């Protein structure tokens, strides 16, 4: 089949540089145009660069201009993208992409894409804080508790209640940048009889920094 | 370059129903060659987009007949006759008439279900946290539908002190509901110099904002 494969993503310091590859099997590379497109962490748009066959012609919008530079090696079935003064707004999933040959100007084949994160953040473990309701939390039947897993880097973190014995009623909000560092929450809902009567503990782990933490939600 | 504006941004549906996504470029899309380079792509949770339709209304090899597209110049429409589960994801219209090529904000097909009110809970900052000199006040808006919702933070009856980060869970696979959390971070100091803290929300499902609140001096 037609299969393009992006690679070389990872973490880079700001203003840094990095070279993404895109290997293209299952077809005549020298024939097609290709591009790199990307998706903002908020899930968007994104044309970066485009190149002809036996690449003597290239296009880069004006924004990308200077930070990004496309190239190919028909002699080798590989397209690339040299990046150079990475801003953090460049963090995104990088797709490799093939143009239909009928020139109808649309991409018929995409790769899985490489991830890229531009942060100068250093590996920081997170601070965990329990979240007791203090105020009722609906002394109805359900009573919600949470864990605020705060300011750590890089992603990802893992959180569980009662070692995983707690699966129901548990939400875990996707992370967000609190400055240059991640913050995330996790919530659990349990029957009023259940707590404070019985223990409820949030487990947190952040392998990039060798952290495991348990935090007991004791009433206040 | 041209702003591809899609509508609506979110679309709730029951399988079997059918839908229409609009897409509206800023400048016109007729290229100086009569071709209108407007396409449609689908992105499935966790995959690369896949082209559905090109040149306004040309089905791509293997795109079921339920799908069809039409339009002229600036306005365009994607239509789906009976939605299958397979049809759910984010849909995008790109254009290629003008360089650089652009894509729309995307449009989301999501399951329709009954309206559901959110369960709100607010939490005072932990002592652990204070000890550190930061103070985070959290508010959980749980399991509610539909998606739209708003949340205001008051402090001593006024609206917020800056560090509000909101966060959304995606639509849930079991009960099709949504959830969100909002956190207001403050210094320990500005925290200690105010007593009432308000998490306030509005969602159609209530004529009036739902309000969870708590005073600092009395836990």
């Amino acid at each position: 089949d037609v299969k393009l494969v992006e690679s070389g993503g990872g973490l880079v310091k700001l203003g840094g540089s990095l070279k993404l590859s895109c290997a293209a099997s299952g077809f005549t590379f020298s024939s097609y145009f290709l591009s790199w497109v990307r998706q903002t962490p908020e899930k968007r748009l994104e044309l970066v660069a485009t190149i002809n066959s036996n690449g003597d012609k290239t296009y880069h919008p004006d924004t990308m201009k200077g930070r990004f530079t496309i190239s190919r090696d028909n002699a080798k079935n590989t397209l690339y993208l040299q990046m150079s003064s990475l801003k953090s707004e460049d963090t995104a999933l990088y797709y490799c992409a093939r143009r239909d040959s009928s020139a109808s100007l649309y991409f018929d084949y995409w790769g899985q894409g490489t991830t890229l994160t531009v942060s100068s953040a250093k590996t920081t473990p997170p601070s965990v804080y329990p979240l007791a309701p203090g105020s009722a939390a609906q002394t109805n039947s359900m009573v919600t508790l949470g864990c605020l897993v705060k300011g750590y880097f890089p992603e990802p973190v893992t959180v569980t209640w009662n070692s995983g014995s707690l699966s129901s009623g548990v939400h875990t909000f996707p992370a967000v940048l609190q400055s240059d560092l991640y913050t995330l929450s996790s919530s659990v809902t349990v029957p009023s009889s259940t707590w404070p009567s019985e223990t409820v503990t949030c487990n947190v782990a952040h392998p990039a920094s060798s952290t495991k933490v348990d935090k007991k939600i004791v009433p206040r | 370059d041209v702003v591809m504006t899609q509508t609506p941004l979110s679309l709730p549906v029951s399988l079997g129903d059918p839908a229409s996504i609009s897409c509206r470029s800023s400048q016109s899309l007729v290229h100086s060659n009569g071709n209108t380079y407007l396409h449609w792509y689908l992105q499935k949770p966790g995959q690369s987009p896949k082209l559905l339709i090109y040149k306004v209304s040309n089905r791509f090899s293997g795109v079921p007949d339920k799908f069809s597209g039409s339009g002229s110049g600036t306005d365009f429409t994607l239509k789906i006759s009976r939605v299958e589960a397979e049809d759910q994801g984010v849909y995008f219209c790109s254009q290629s008439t003008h360089v650089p090529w652009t894509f729309g904000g995307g449009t989301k097909l999501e399951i329709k279900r009954a309206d559901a009110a959110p369960t709100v809970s607010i939490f005072p900052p932990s002592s652990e946290q204070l000890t550190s000199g930061g103070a985070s006040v959290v508010c959980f808006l749980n399991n509610f539908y539909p998606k739209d919702i708003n949340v205001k933070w008051k402090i001593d009856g006024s609206e917020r002190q800056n560090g509000v980060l909101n966060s959304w869970t995606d639509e849930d696979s079991k009960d099709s509901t949504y959830s969100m959390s909002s956190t207001l971070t403050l210094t320990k100091d500005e925290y200690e110099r105010h007593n009432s803290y308000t998490c306030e929300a509005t969602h159609k499902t209530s004529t009036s904002p739902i309000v969870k609140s708590f005073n600092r001096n009395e836990c």
Partner: peptide, 11 residues
């Protein structure tokens, strides 16, 4: 404005 160029439309 910036329609798409001749090249790119080649093939």
């Amino acid at each position: 404005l910036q329609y798409t160029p001749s090249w790119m439309l080649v093939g």
